[PDB]
Amino acid sequence: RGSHMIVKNGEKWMDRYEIDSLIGKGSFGQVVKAYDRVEQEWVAIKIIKNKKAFLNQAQIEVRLLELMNKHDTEMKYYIVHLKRHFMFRNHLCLVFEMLSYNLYDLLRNTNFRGVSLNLTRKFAQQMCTALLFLATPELSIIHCDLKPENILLCNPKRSAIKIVDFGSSCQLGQRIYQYIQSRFYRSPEVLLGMPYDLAIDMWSLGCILVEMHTGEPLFSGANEVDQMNKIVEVLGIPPAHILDQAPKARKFFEKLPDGTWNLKKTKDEYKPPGTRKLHNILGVETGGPGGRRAGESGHTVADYLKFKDLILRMLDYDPKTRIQPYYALQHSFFKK
Ligand SMILES: Cc1nc(NCc2c(F)cccc2F)c2c(-c3ccnc(N)c3)c[nH]c2n1
Numbered sequence: 001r002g003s004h005m006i007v008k009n010g011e012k013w014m015d016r017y018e019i020d021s022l023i024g025k026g027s028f029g030q031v032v033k034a035y036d037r038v039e040q041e042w043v044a045i046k047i048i049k050n051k052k053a054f055l056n057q058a059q060i061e062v063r064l065l066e067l068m069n070k071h072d073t074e075m076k077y078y079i080v081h082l083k084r085h086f087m088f089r090n091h092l093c094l095v096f097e098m099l100s101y102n103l104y105d106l107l108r109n110t111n112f113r114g115v116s117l118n119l120t121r122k123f124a125q126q127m128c129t130a131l132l133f134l135a136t137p138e139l140s141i142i143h144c145d146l147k148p149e150n151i152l153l154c155n156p157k158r159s160a161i162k163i164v165d166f167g168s169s170c171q172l173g174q175r176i177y178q179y180i181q182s183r184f185y186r187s188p189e190v191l192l193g194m195p196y197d198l199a200i201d202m203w204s205l206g207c208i209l210v211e212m213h214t215g216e217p218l219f220s221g222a223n224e225v226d227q228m229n230k231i232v233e234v235l236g237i238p239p240a241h242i243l244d245q246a247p248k249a250r251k252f253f254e255k256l257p258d259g260t261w262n263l264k265k266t267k268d269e270y271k272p273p274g275t276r277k278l279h280n281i282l283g284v285e286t287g288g289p290g291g292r293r294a295g296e297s298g299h300t301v302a303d304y305l306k307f308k309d310l311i312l313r314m315l316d317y318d319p320k321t322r323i324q325p326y327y328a329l330q331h332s333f334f335k336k
């Protein structure tokens with residue numbers, strides 16, 4: 001009774017799946033680590049709730065990464081592999097490859113100190129490859145929920161990562177669901193109710209990489225007004241040419257005499273627009289985030305300037321000008 005299924009541990013499904021542990025619940029239902037008796041390998045099984053909303057979302061997710069499986073390319077390997085699917089005990093079940101803990105657990109491991117710029121660089125490259133694969137014309141898949149939680153390590157003692165959770169995913173010209181992207185990673189086009197393309201995932205990747213290295217969220221809004229006001233602290237007021245074409249622009253800003261845009265009141269107070277420099281957040285010249293990387297190998301001002309430039313390309317207010325996967329992979333921040 002209710003949405004969920006039966007958690008036991010030790011139970012064996014279809015004389016094939018030996019269930020030993022629950023990895024973690026999601027909005028969509030459960031994920032469990034089990035053993036495959038016929039393929040002789042470990043598997044994580046996504047158990048979708050017995051509801052239309054989540055089932056319909058699962059059917060899209062199934063369809064999208066089946067489509068990804070057709071492509072002959074090394075790059076497809078940065079997306080989680082779906083081995084098979086079957087309905088069982090009235091639940092849709094997706095069998096995936098076993099991966100490891102997410103990048104939010106890896107940050108919690110360091111007590112939110114952040115990982116090294118060297119590891120942040122490896123993550124940034126694998127994700128830029130993954131976003132590139134998604135952008136293949138035949139695919140043109142917009143994940144719409146990229147965040148540390150949906151980025152998983154393959155093995156806990158190694159740097160290789162993959163993207164998971166394509167329940168929220170759509171395809172370029174579509175406007176299916178009311179709510180897309182996690183608030184902290186929500187790109188400003190989505191905050192202002194403007195149409196969105198594959199550019200919104202690159203804005204999420206930008207916020208994620210800064211958090212990976214500083215150890216904390218770049219823009220941690222409690223609500224949508226908080227989110228925009230905190231993005232404005234770092235990047236200033238958005239372009240007038242953007243705010244002039246945005247349905248929800250007059251939620252957060254106000255048109256002035258000069259045809260200019262100034263902020264609305266705190267109601268009841270943020271740092272003035274663009275005064276919370278990304279220079280001091282990364283601490284390019286003050287020994288890295290909170291001074292914690294001072295003296296440390298591979299944490300030079302030169303290295304912090306290249307990372308800073310690349311993140312600022314990814315945090316472009318303009319989705320037309322924001323850096324695309326193919327070109328972010330040519331950046332000096334990755335230069336060999
Ligand atoms: C250790 C582990 N873990 C995994 N999942 C971790 C996890 C949770 F435990 C709970 C909620 C979301 C989530 F990604 C997964 C998934 C997975 C899971 C969900 N959706 C997709 N598309 C893939 C595949 N392999 C996994 N391996």
Ligand SMILES: [Cl-]
Pocket residue numbers: 223224225
């Ligand atoms: Cl709000």
